[PDB]
Amino acid sequence: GLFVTLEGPEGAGKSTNRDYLAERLRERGIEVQLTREPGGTPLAERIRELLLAPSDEPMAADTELLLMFAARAQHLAGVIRPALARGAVVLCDRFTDATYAYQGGGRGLPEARIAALESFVQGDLRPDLTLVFDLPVEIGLARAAARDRFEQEDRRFFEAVRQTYLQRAAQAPERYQVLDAGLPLAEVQAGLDRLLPNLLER
Ligand SMILES: Cn1c(=O)[nH]c2ncc(-c3ccccc3)cc21
Numbered sequence: 001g002l003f004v005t006l007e008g009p010e011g012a013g014k015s016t017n018r019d020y021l022a023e024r025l026r027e028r029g030i031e032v033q034l035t036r037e038p039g040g041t042p043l044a045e046r047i048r049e050l051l052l053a054p055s056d057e058p059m060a061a062d063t064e065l066l067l068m069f070a071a072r073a074q075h076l077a078g079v080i081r082p083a084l085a086r087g088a089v090v091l092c093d094r095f096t097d098a099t100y101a102y103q104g105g106g107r108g109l110p111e112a113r114i115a116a117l118e119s120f121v122q123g124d125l126r127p128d129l130t131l132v133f134d135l136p137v138e139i140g141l142a143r144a145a146a147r148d149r150f151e152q153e154d155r156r157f158f159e160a161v162r163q164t165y166l167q168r169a170a171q172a173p174e175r176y177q178v179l180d181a182g183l184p185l186a187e188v189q190a191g192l193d194r195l196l197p198n199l200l201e202r
């Protein structure tokens with residue numbers, strides 16, 4: 001099977017580009033399992049709700065980080081590892097890169113703390129490829145106003161999230177493809193068409 005993750009803000013066309021990529025796989029042999037984090041199983045989605053619902057009790061950062069990883073542990077067991085087991089391609093909206101970006105970059109938790117949970121929860125399992133939908137934050141912020149606890153975050157939070165994805169990509173370039181989601185969809189999908197050979201390769 002193949003484990004592909006998609007990262008970036010929702011105003012970035014992630015969803016429509018995921019559908020584009022899923023169509024290209026299904027018109028070939030390929031089983032596609034679409035999924036998203038936090039969530040993807042009934043229990044993971046209950047955890048999602050705790051994470052996204054605003055509250056008058058401020059959630060501790062260590063709490064947010066641990067809930068993200070709890071949902072991930074359930075999701076890996078309920079959905080991701082089985083998919084991969086039967087040779088499917090998983091197209092997962094957000095994964096541990098998002099933890100580095102939102103909880104590490106956004107919240108300022110130490111990368112070491114995130115890296116330690118990543119190893120505990122996932123073992124050696126990492127995405128085979130990660131698509132970063134990169135977008136200047138003003139566009140991201142406009143699109144969020146036009147459209148939860150994260151949507152309501154400030155400018156400096158979102159700047160940290162964007163640049164953390166870009167740093168993560170730069171450190172392990174064989175695992176990432178950065179896409180300029182400020183381009184019109186046609187040129188973004190052209191870019192996806194260009195990755196498909198490699199993706200089918202893996
Ligand atoms: C999967 N994931 C994570 O590990 N850390 C995360 N922080 C924020 C989001 C998220 C979820 C919904 C809307 C916006 C951001 C998702 C995250």
Ligand SMILES: [Mg+2]
Nearest residue numbers: 106153154157
């Ligand atoms: Mg804040």
